[PDB]
Amino acid sequence: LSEQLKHCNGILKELLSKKHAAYAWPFYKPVDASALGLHDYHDIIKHPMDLSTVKRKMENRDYRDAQEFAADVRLMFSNCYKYNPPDHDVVAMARKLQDVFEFRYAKMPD
Ligand SMILES: COc1cc(OC)c2c(=O)[nH]c(-c3cc(C)c(OCCO)c(C)c3)nc2c1
Numbered sequence: 001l002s003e004q005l006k007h008c009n010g011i012l013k014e015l016l017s018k019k020h021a022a023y024a025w026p027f028y029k030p031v032d033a034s035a036l037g038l039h040d041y042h043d044i045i046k047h048p049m050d051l052s053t054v055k056r057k058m059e060n061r062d063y064r065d066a067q068e069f070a071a072d073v074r075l076m077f078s079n080c081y082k083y084n085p086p087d088h089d090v091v092a093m094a095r096k097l098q099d100v101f102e103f104r105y106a107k108m109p110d
Pocket of ligand 1: 037083084
């Protein structure tokens with residue numbers, strides 16, 4: 001599972017790469033609810049998550065296994081699906097980035 005954590009890190013790097021930037025960018029940094037006018041965001045979302053936070057946790061060796069890492073990535077998408085009207089542009093972007101994630105996560109080495 002050092003090997004599994006390296007697969008996870010590879011996924012993370014891909015998610016942050018220019019390849020996916022057109023739909024990944026809203027996930028780069030924590031949602032700035034204040035800035036955006038989303039004054040209910042932190043009443044609705046108990047545990048914010050974003051790719052910069054996942055990167056910091058990987059860098060700090062916070063994740064002890066692939067499943068812990070995946071839980072944070074899925075939390076980030078679930079927060080998006082919870083908060084937003086399902087026709088919002090950001091939800092379309094979340095679906096696309098999550099397709100990238102789930103297909104490559106599935107290729108995890110034993
Ligand atoms: C700039 O990055 C983001 C990332 C986001 O999530 C990962 C979101 C997100 O979850 N919702 C919204 C968002 C923004 C506005 C101004 C909204 O009001 C529409 C008018 O009623 C709504 C419903 C959602 N913007 C994000 C921006």
